[PDB]
Design an enzyme around this catalytic site. Structure first.
Site, mmCIF file in Angstrom:
data_model
loop_
_atom_site.group_PDB
_atom_site.id
_atom_site.type_symbol
_atom_site.label_atom_id
_atom_site.label_comp_id
_atom_site.label_asym_id
_atom_site.label_seq_id
_atom_site.Cartn_x
_atom_site.Cartn_y
_atom_site.Cartn_z
ATOM 1 N N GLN A 11 0.823 -1.203 0.000
ATOM 2 C CA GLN A 11 0.000 0.000 0.000
ATOM 3 C C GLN A 11 0.858 1.254 0.000
ATOM 4 O O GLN A 11 0.583 2.201 -0.740
ATOM 5 C CB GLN A 11 -0.942 0.009 1.200
ATOM 6 C CG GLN A 11 -1.755 1.280 1.321
ATOM 7 C CD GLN A 11 -3.056 1.063 2.057
ATOM 8 O OE1 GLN A 11 -3.107 0.331 3.042
ATOM 9 N NE2 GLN A 11 -4.118 1.695 1.581
ATOM 10 N N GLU A 63 -3.389 -7.136 -2.011
ATOM 11 C CA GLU A 63 -4.679 -6.563 -1.665
ATOM 12 C C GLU A 63 -5.289 -5.875 -2.874
ATOM 13 O O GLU A 63 -4.599 -5.131 -3.579
ATOM 14 C CB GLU A 63 -4.536 -5.553 -0.530
ATOM 15 C CG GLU A 63 -5.757 -5.439 0.357
ATOM 16 C CD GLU A 63 -5.513 -4.553 1.559
ATOM 17 O OE1 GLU A 63 -4.334 -4.266 1.857
ATOM 18 O OE2 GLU A 63 -6.499 -4.148 2.208
ATOM 19 N N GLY A 136 3.565 -7.040 5.578
ATOM 20 C CA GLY A 136 3.796 -8.320 4.926
ATOM 21 C C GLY A 136 4.013 -8.185 3.432
ATOM 22 O O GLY A 136 4.903 -8.817 2.862
ATOM 23 N N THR A 137 3.196 -7.361 2.775
ATOM 24 C CA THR A 137 3.404 -7.086 1.358
ATOM 25 C C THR A 137 4.726 -6.369 1.128
ATOM 26 O O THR A 137 5.597 -6.859 0.402
ATOM 27 C CB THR A 137 2.243 -6.265 0.801
ATOM 28 O OG1 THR A 137 2.165 -5.012 1.492
ATOM 29 C CG2 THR A 137 0.938 -7.015 0.943
ATOM 30 N N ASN A 198 8.023 7.949 8.809
ATOM 31 C CA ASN A 198 6.798 8.731 8.824
ATOM 32 C C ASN A 198 6.876 9.836 9.863
ATOM 33 O O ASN A 198 6.395 10.946 9.629
ATOM 34 C CB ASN A 198 5.599 7.826 9.097
ATOM 35 C CG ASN A 198 5.248 6.952 7.916
ATOM 36 O OD1 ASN A 198 5.849 7.059 6.850
ATOM 37 N ND2 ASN A 198 4.269 6.077 8.099
ATOM 38 N N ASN A 220 3.660 11.280 0.616
ATOM 39 C CA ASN A 220 4.026 10.700 -0.667
ATOM 40 C C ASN A 220 4.427 11.775 -1.664
ATOM 41 O O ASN A 220 5.304 11.549 -2.498
ATOM 42 C CB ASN A 220 2.873 9.864 -1.208
ATOM 43 C CG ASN A 220 2.398 8.832 -0.217
ATOM 44 O OD1 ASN A 220 3.058 8.571 0.786
ATOM 45 N ND2 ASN A 220 1.236 8.253 -0.478
ATOM 46 N N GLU A 246 26.467 6.269 -10.685
ATOM 47 C CA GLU A 246 27.370 7.118 -9.918
ATOM 48 C C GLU A 246 26.976 7.206 -8.454
ATOM 49 O O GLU A 246 27.850 7.389 -7.596
ATOM 50 C CB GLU A 246 27.429 8.527 -10.515
ATOM 51 C CG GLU A 246 28.338 8.632 -11.729
ATOM 52 C CD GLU A 246 27.855 9.594 -12.783
ATOM 53 O OE1 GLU A 246 26.659 9.913 -12.793
ATOM 54 O OE2 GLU A 246 28.676 10.031 -13.613
HETATM 55 N N1 LIG Z 1 5.075 7.138 3.872
HETATM 56 C C1 LIG Z 1 3.953 6.438 3.754
HETATM 57 N N2 LIG Z 1 3.817 5.242 4.423
HETATM 58 C C2 LIG Z 1 2.676 4.525 4.315
HETATM 59 C C3 LIG Z 1 1.640 4.979 3.523
HETATM 60 N N3 LIG Z 1 0.639 4.083 3.589
HETATM 61 C C4 LIG Z 1 1.020 3.069 4.394
HETATM 62 N N4 LIG Z 1 2.277 3.334 4.860
HETATM 63 C C5 LIG Z 1 3.074 2.471 5.747
HETATM 64 O O1 LIG Z 1 3.077 1.174 5.188
HETATM 65 C C6 LIG Z 1 3.000 0.191 6.192
HETATM 66 C C7 LIG Z 1 2.208 -1.016 5.703
HETATM 67 O O2 LIG Z 1 2.219 -1.073 4.297
HETATM 68 P P1 LIG Z 1 1.638 -2.364 3.528
HETATM 69 O O3 LIG Z 1 2.446 -3.589 3.854
HETATM 70 O O4 LIG Z 1 1.668 -2.111 2.047
HETATM 71 O O5 LIG Z 1 0.111 -2.534 4.007
HETATM 72 P P2 LIG Z 1 -0.905 -3.477 3.181
HETATM 73 O O6 LIG Z 1 -1.336 -2.909 1.858
HETATM 74 O O7 LIG Z 1 -2.111 -3.800 4.022
HETATM 75 O O8 LIG Z 1 -0.039 -4.803 2.961
HETATM 76 P P3 LIG Z 1 0.243 -5.766 4.208
HETATM 77 O O9 LIG Z 1 0.029 -4.980 5.473
HETATM 78 O O10 LIG Z 1 1.663 -6.247 4.124
HETATM 79 O O11 LIG Z 1 -0.695 -6.943 4.164
HETATM 80 C C8 LIG Z 1 2.356 0.863 7.385
HETATM 81 O O12 LIG Z 1 3.083 0.546 8.544
HETATM 82 C C9 LIG Z 1 2.461 2.349 7.127
HETATM 83 O O13 LIG Z 1 3.307 2.925 8.088
HETATM 84 C C10 LIG Z 1 1.767 6.180 2.850
HETATM 85 O O14 LIG Z 1 0.850 6.586 2.147
HETATM 86 N N5 LIG Z 1 2.928 6.910 2.965
#
Ligand SMILES: Nc1nc2c(ncn2[C@@H]2O[C@H](COP(=O)(O)OP(=O)(O)OP(=O)(O)O)[C@@H](O)[C@H]2O)c(=O)[nH]1
Ligand SMILES: Nc1nc2c(ncn2[C@@H]2O[C@H](COP(=O)(O)OP(=O)(O)O)[C@@H](O)[C@H]2O)c(=O)[nH]1
Ligand SMILES: Nc1nc2c(ncn2[C@@H]2O[C@H](COP(=O)(O)OP(=O)(O)O)[C@@H](O)[C@H]2O)c(=O)[nH]1
Lengths: 430, 84, 172, 431, 431
Positions: A11, A63, A136-137, A198, A220, A246
């Site tokens: 995500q 997802e 996890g992703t 973050n 983002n 580089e």
């Molecule tokens: N900088 C930033 N971090 C984000 C953002 N959205 C989510 N995160 C971080 O991403 C982490 C989880 O990401 P993902 O693993 O992709 O979540 P998911 O899509 O449900 O996939 P899984 O949790 O692995 O099943 C969280 O701990 C957030 O801190 C975002 O828009 N910007």
């Protein structure tokens, strides 16, 4: 000629990719429909005979919601539908789920699509892998994909723009666990890893952008501006051209030490813009201010090893050299004894474009400072006790083991981050 | 009444590169090869040593039984419980 | 409860029952082992003492559990979900629960849960209680098996911390 | 595309499920005749989670109603949303289980369980990808608890890897409805510990307290309690149905919440619960939502969290909100109430955000707290179970159904083991 | 231009055949006066399979109604479609067989069989090409079973290569209509094994259960059972009469179904059988039809497939459908229920698709399963036959009709041999 393949996993990866591709479309003038009304787009877009440009990107997730948001949004006619890859079951913050059980077929399909993408590039500067360490992703599938890419493509420069969990504030519970696992995984595969927190980006937004309610879209957008500044020398000409290849040689002293702080400047809203001169020296000072770092890691604790400066816009080499000389003469900034040079200066003549509706102002100058420093060992030190605190009584361990992991894997990951701590201390010490 | 953690090693008929050693029958050490490519002179993890109640590098099943569970079975016939 | 306890009065029927168990247990093909044991098998020999004079004096209540656990697979070679990975996940979970119980016993915390899996439930009296436990650690020294060997050695080292009771329990 | 199979059990479970389906259809803009009338793309985007499309535009719930007496489902079918459910998904016996867990689990539930599993399999195989099942029922009831536990065991056997979510109405502490509530609850907790992956503990007296103190209602009927429970059951899975800034499905919640498998009982609450008088007088802010969230009174379980220690706590927020706001607020909550939070978990918070709040509410948030406070609920139920079991009161009703006396002792042992498990992690120290 | 000679035998057979002809005429747009009122070219395209053209636009069925008592034929002629049949094709006796197989096969069968064979020959010789004969009747009746077995033997002698199809209504398990049903059924099975090339087994009580459960009818007469049997009888040959994306005639079905000549008894079913109430609620899809197909309740036979093992299974689908969909669905069914499917046959699926569905239904599907489950039905009928034959109850009429006692033992021996073959091929293992 200078193509760079972008991967966005999880995500957070996809949501920073949305900002990235909005920024690239605005920067190259490509309309969201796909076509624009020389050849600076080739680094990020491949043009078809009809005039429609498709970006060389891959949106990977287990997802469906995040990818379907893209499929329904404005950029539905831009990205290749086969490039958008969606799973069925989410990884559920389980590195084992995203690395051992669910991620297998998805990474196979992703490898196929990436091979189709890379067969379309004459040259290939590298991969820009965008994930979030702590899911996890992002962790599991990101690590699996990076391992496969290292196996097959080999020497290609893989730049992992990872988001690490903040020291105190966080959104997950097993985040230290999968963060340690993914750190162990990508310690040996990615060539340059850029750390982001973050918490630090929130502090940047609150103090410099004066946003009392920062959100993921703002985070983002900041990250995307950093990436565009990093890649500006690929697409637009200017004095002191820098390349992805580089970056490695001028930033990584030893292969284990390739995690990097990133800091952009200026980060100012329109209201406070054109109130200060924003000269080259002042923006470099701001870029080296400990607050502007996008990792909750005070550089004053450690010692800088290398600092690569990426300047955009009306910047002159005389000013950049004077500014970096002042930085070197300043006492607070401290470099290691074995790196007298420690600076990789690059300028570019294309100023960063402003996304309409964003909070960043239209500034004729910009700096992206990416630093390799031993200070970053602090974040690893935090995660190393956050891990072992729960690992002492095996919290949440059954979840990860249920998807084909072993206690030995946790022990090995903990030992590897301990070894990384020793590496940082060793390289820091005389 | 203590736990007697014994270790028994599979005799590799292919005779692979064996890194384990036993100096006195009590301690066992494994030396993981440091990766030369990954971070030269920047790894710092090579040796792992442990101490147990016995190691059996290459023994017959008769010897393994005699040194492993003879006392436990004797305790079983003496009324004590046992678990191997 | 419900376990078919078979009395034995000569060596041959003991051998026959054991070999019947050997036939009946579940084994599956695998890359590391041609016939991998995919189930934790427990062979308990229950001994019921009675004195030379006998006549209801100092009887019964002795046990000896011979247990062959299932291997801890890395789950990167198996891959196939066809009852090679799905059951490997269960084996790994049971082994992790056993190791967590060992950790809690070494820390000597109050309750050290035993119900989280059938393995710890069966070995509740063992590993504690009143039972003389002697763990066996079968390792395989290979150039690439070092990680698994070290995992086994770490588990064995943490097991060595434990020490149980020895009570001459007899019939009630 | 991640479906959820809903099951309702017993009178209480069936009423809760009927109210839940009414609320879900309302939130998706579905009228009782099944036609969509919401005029919003997002409502129909993920309707396949709960509904299937019939030949026409009709959308029928993926729900299965069980009972041993047909009166409860006659009332359900006469209810406002009674016609949406499949006529084939109403499974009933003939004679009700007289508040007898033994009758609902061994004698009378055995014959109906085959039909129940047939319908459940028919619904589940139709699903493309199945997140899992959610079973709404009440502990302390014959058909409800008995058939709920039996069905949960059967579904666990059939689909081990699929998520199991349970909404169990634990018998209330102070005022009890049925006399054999301790027996039924103790026997049902034994099955829920072993089988249900994720369990929600609800108490009618806690619901009465929340509706009389925060909602300030005068005549709160069972419709209102079922409405609050339904709101929580919707809020737990809105991340599956609507786009979210940081989405989190049921398995993600389970992973981030359950430290150890047996400790899967959660107290839950919904915000913002505002009285009619002070609705205009309350200001909808994320800090206000969190402040109401972490109040003990907001909990729909009788146990108050102050006595115990929060092992974990997840909050699924809904609305257009600042993730910085949410994370800062819950980190501040953890820092301020660190005494009530477990030390050997550095962050006891699983924060998730969805972009679609429930209708009428600008913002909302559902809370799912795993705390050792539930120790006292289990302890009270045991204090009643042992008192009755020492004299074997009402034990002949269960014994004549073909259930051994030893099963009561085994269930009590399991329940007390769970109690001591919670106590160990309540007073466990770091390092 | 592949013709089929339809024959109705006994009261049950005549009623079922009358319903079958009414259904076929409705499907082909034929009014009871025979004039074509269909307004569709395909209906007349292959009308010659079952019907013949008269001098005018009238169309006469290729049907022969044979019986020993004229009452059933009088009722059939007074019925709505009683005028279509040629008046010469009504072959009736004067004294009926009193539910006596011996009477219907030896004493009263000898005289009428000559006229029956004459009419059969007259109808067959007119046909350009003859696919074969289909005889509808019920086991457990004097004239029905008797005329059926004797006529089938005579037709087997005359036309060995021509296809032989039988629709036998086997006596129902729990409630029997006549006392001598086990005797008649045992005597008929011996003949059907030897002579009939292909046979369908039907049960009145399986019909009752399916019409009360899936159709949910309240007071359904024998007409509805005959309607469903007629639907199956039409669907088995709709490939002959209508264009098919993957067509399969009777002999193709027989070859793909019958592994060994003696195992030619099959249980059939029809989909989609939807209750009037839930007609709007169910979804008409190929997966739905397959799911209803493979249900044991949808099977028209008392023996449930779960007990036995499927030797083969053919499915004749009707409607505009994806061949990929049908093949994938049935392969998925085989993969799931591989335990119930015979191992030494790699594919137990014979899928045929026709482009013309029945009137009113967008899509439909008829199922023909050869499974060892029918072993239990043969076993039950044997348990009744042996019980009666041990004391020789009711044996004196069959003795007085000039049929030897040794014939009962021979018939029982062959029937038990069939049971043994079903068991052997049920428990036969690969390699
Ligand atoms: N900088 C930033 N971090 C984000 C953002 N959205 C989510 N995160 C971080 O991403 C982490 C989880 O990401 P993902 O693993 O992709 O979540 P998911 O899509 O449900 O996939 P899984 O949790 O692995 O099943 C969280 O701990 C957030 O801190 C975002 O828009 N910007
Ligand atoms: N929340 C809620 N609880 C109910 C309702 N009806 C009954 N209950 C509670 O459910 C508990 C058990 O009753 P129940 O299981 O439904 O009886 P059974 O269906 O015959 O097993 C009782 O203690 C009631 O307090 C209702 O409509 N809503
Ligand atoms: N489906 C159906 N079955 C019938 C009907 N009439 C009789 N049967 C069944 O046919 C079986 C045998 O009767 P049958 O052979 O026709 O009597 P027979 O004509 O004197 O030989 C009985 O068990 C009845 O249950 C009917 O109209 N429809």
């Amino acid at each position: 000629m200078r193509e760079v393949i972008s991967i966005h996993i999880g995500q957070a990866g996809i949501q920073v990719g949305n900002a990235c591709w909005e920024l690239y479309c605005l920067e190259h003038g490509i309309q969201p429909d796909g076509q624009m009304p020389d050849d600076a787009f080739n680094t990020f877009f491949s043009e078809t005979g009809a005039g429609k440009h498709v970006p060389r990107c891959i949106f990977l997730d287990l997802e469906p919601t995040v990818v379907d948001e893209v499929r329904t949004g404005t950029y539905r006619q831009l990205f290749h539908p086969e490039q958008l890859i969606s799973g069925k079951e989410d990884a559920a913050n389980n590195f084992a789920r995203g690395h051992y059980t669910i991620g297998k077929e998805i990474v196979d399909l992703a490898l196929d699509r990436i091979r189709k993408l890379a067969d379309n590039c004459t040259g290939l500067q590298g991969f820009l892998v965008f994930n979030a360490v702590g899911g996890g992703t992002g962790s599991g599938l990101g690590s699996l994909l990076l391992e496969r890419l290292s196996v097959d493509y080999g020497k290609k420069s893989k730049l992992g723009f990872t988001v690490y969990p903040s020291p105190q504030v966080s959104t997950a519970v097993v985040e230290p666990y999968n963060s340690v696992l993914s750190t162990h995984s990508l310690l040996e595969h990615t060539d340059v890893a850029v750390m982001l927190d973050n918490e630090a980006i929130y502090d940047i937004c609150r103090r410099s952008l004066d946003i009392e309610r920062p959100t993921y879209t703002n985070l983002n957008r900041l990250i995307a501006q950093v990436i565009s500044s990093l890649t500006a020398s690929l697409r637009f000409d200017g004095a002191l051209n820098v390349d992805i290849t580089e970056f490695q040689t001028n930033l990584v002293p030893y292969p284990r030490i390739h995690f990097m702080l990133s800091s952009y400047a200026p980060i100012i809203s329109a209201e406070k813009a054109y109130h200060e001169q924003l000269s080259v020296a002042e923006i470099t000072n701001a870029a080296f201010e400990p607050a502007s770092m996008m990792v909750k890691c005070d550089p004053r604790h450690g010692k800088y090893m290398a600092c690569c400066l990426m300047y955009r816009g009306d910047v002159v080499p005389k000013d950049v050299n004077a500014s970096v000389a002042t930085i070197k003469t300043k006492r607070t900034i401290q470099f290691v004894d074995w790196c007298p040079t420690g600076f990789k200066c690059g300028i570019n003549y294309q100023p960063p474009t402003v996304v309409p509706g964003g909070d960043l102002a239209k500034v004729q100058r910009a700096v992206c400072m990416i630093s390799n420093s031993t200070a970053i060992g602090e974040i690893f030190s935090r995660l190393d006790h956050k891990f072992d605190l729960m690992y002492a009584k095996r919290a949440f361990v059954h979840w990860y083991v249920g998807e084909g992991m072993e206690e030995g894997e946790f022990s090995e990951a903990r030992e590897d981050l301990a070894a990384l701590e020793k590496d940082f201390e060793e390289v820091g010490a005389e | 009444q203590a736990v007697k953690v014994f270790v028994r090693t599979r005799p590799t008929a292919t005779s692979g590169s064996g890194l384990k050693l036993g100096p006195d029958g009590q301690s066992v050490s494994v030396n993981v090869p440091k990766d030369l490519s990954a971070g030269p002179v920047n790894n710092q993890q090579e040796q792992f040593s442990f101490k147990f109640d016995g190691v059996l590098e290459n023994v017959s099943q008769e010897a393994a039984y005699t040194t492993l569970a003879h006392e436990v079975v004797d305790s079983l016939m003496a009324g004590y419980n046992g678990t191997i | 409860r419900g376990l078919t306890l078979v009395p034995v009065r000569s060596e041959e029927e003991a051998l026959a029952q054991f070999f019947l168990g050997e036939q009946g247990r579940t084994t599956a093909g695998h890359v590391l082992n041609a016939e991998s044991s995919r189930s934790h098998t427990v062979f308990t020999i229950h001994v019921e003492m009675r004195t030379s004079d006998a006549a209801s004096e100092r009887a019964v209540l002795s046990k000896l559990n011979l247990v062959d656990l299932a291997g801890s697979e890395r789950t990167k070679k198996t891959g196939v979900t066809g009852q090679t990975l799905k059951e490997a996940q269960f084996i790994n979970r049971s082994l992790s629960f056993l190791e967590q119980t060992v950790n809690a016993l070494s820390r000597k915390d109050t309750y050290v849960p035993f119900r989280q899996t059938k393995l710890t439930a069966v070995l509740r009296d063992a590993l504690g209680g009143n039972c003389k436990t002697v763990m066996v650690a079968n390792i395989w020294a290979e150039p690439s098996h070092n990680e698994e060997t070290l995992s086994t050695l770490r588990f064995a080292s943490r097991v060595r911390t434990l020490t149980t009771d020895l009570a001459l329990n007899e019939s009630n | 595309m991640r479906e959820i199979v809903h099951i309702q059990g017993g009178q209480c479970g069936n009423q809760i499920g009927a109210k839940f389906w009414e609320v879900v259809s309302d939130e998706h803009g579905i009228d009782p005749t099944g036609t969509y009338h919401g005029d919003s793309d997002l409502q129909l985007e993920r309707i396949n989670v709960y509904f299937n499309e019939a030949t026409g535009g009709r959308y029928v719930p993926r729900a299965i109603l069980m009972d041993l007496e047909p009166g409860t489902m006659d009332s359900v079918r006469s209810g406002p949303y009674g016609q949406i459910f499949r006529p084939d998904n109403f499974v009933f016996g003939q004679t009700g289980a007289g508040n007898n867990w033994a009758k609902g689990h061994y004698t009378e539930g055995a014959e109906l369980i085959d039909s129940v599993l047939d319908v459940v399999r028919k619904e589940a195989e139709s699903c493309d990808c199945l997140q899992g099942f959610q079973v709404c029922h009440s502990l302390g009831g014959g058909t409800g608890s008995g058939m709920g536990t039996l069905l949960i065991s059967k579904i666990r056997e059939e689909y081990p890897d699929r998520m199991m979510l349970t909404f169990s109405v634990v018998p209330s502490p102070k005022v009890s409805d049925t006399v054999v509530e301790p027996y039924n609850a103790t026997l049902s907790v034994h099955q829920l510990v072993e089988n249900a992956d994720e369990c929600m503990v609800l108490d009618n007296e806690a619901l009465y307290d929340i509706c009389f103190r925060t909602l300030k209602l005068t005549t709160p009927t069972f419709g209102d309690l079922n409405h609050l429970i339904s709101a929580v059951m919707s809020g737990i899975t809105c991340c599956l149905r609507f786009p979210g800034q940081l989405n989190a499905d049921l398995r993600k919640l389970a992973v981030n919440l359950i430290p150890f498998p047996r400790l899967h009982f959660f107290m839950v609450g919904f915000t913002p619960l505002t009285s009619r008088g002070s609705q205009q007088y309350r200001a909808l802010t994320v800090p206000e939502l969190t402040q109401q969230m972490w109040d003990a009174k907001n909990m729909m379980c009788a146990a108050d969290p102050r006595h115990g220690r929060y092992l974990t706590a997840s909050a699924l927020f809904r609305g257009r909100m600042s993730t910085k706001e949410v994370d800062e607020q819950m980190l501040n909550v953890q820092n301020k109430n660190s005494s009530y939070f477990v030390e050997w978990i550095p962050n006891n918070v699983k924060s998730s955000v969805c972009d679609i709040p429930p209708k009428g509410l600008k913002m909302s948030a559902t809370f799912i707290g795993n705390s050792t406070a539930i120790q006292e609920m289990f302890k009270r139920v045991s204090e009643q179970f042992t008192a009755m079991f020492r004299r074997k009161a009402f034990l002949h009703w269960y014994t004549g159904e073909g259930m051994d006396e030893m099963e009561f002792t085994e269930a009590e042992s399991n329940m007390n083991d769970l109690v001591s498990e919670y106590q160990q992690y309540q007073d466990a120290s770091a390092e």
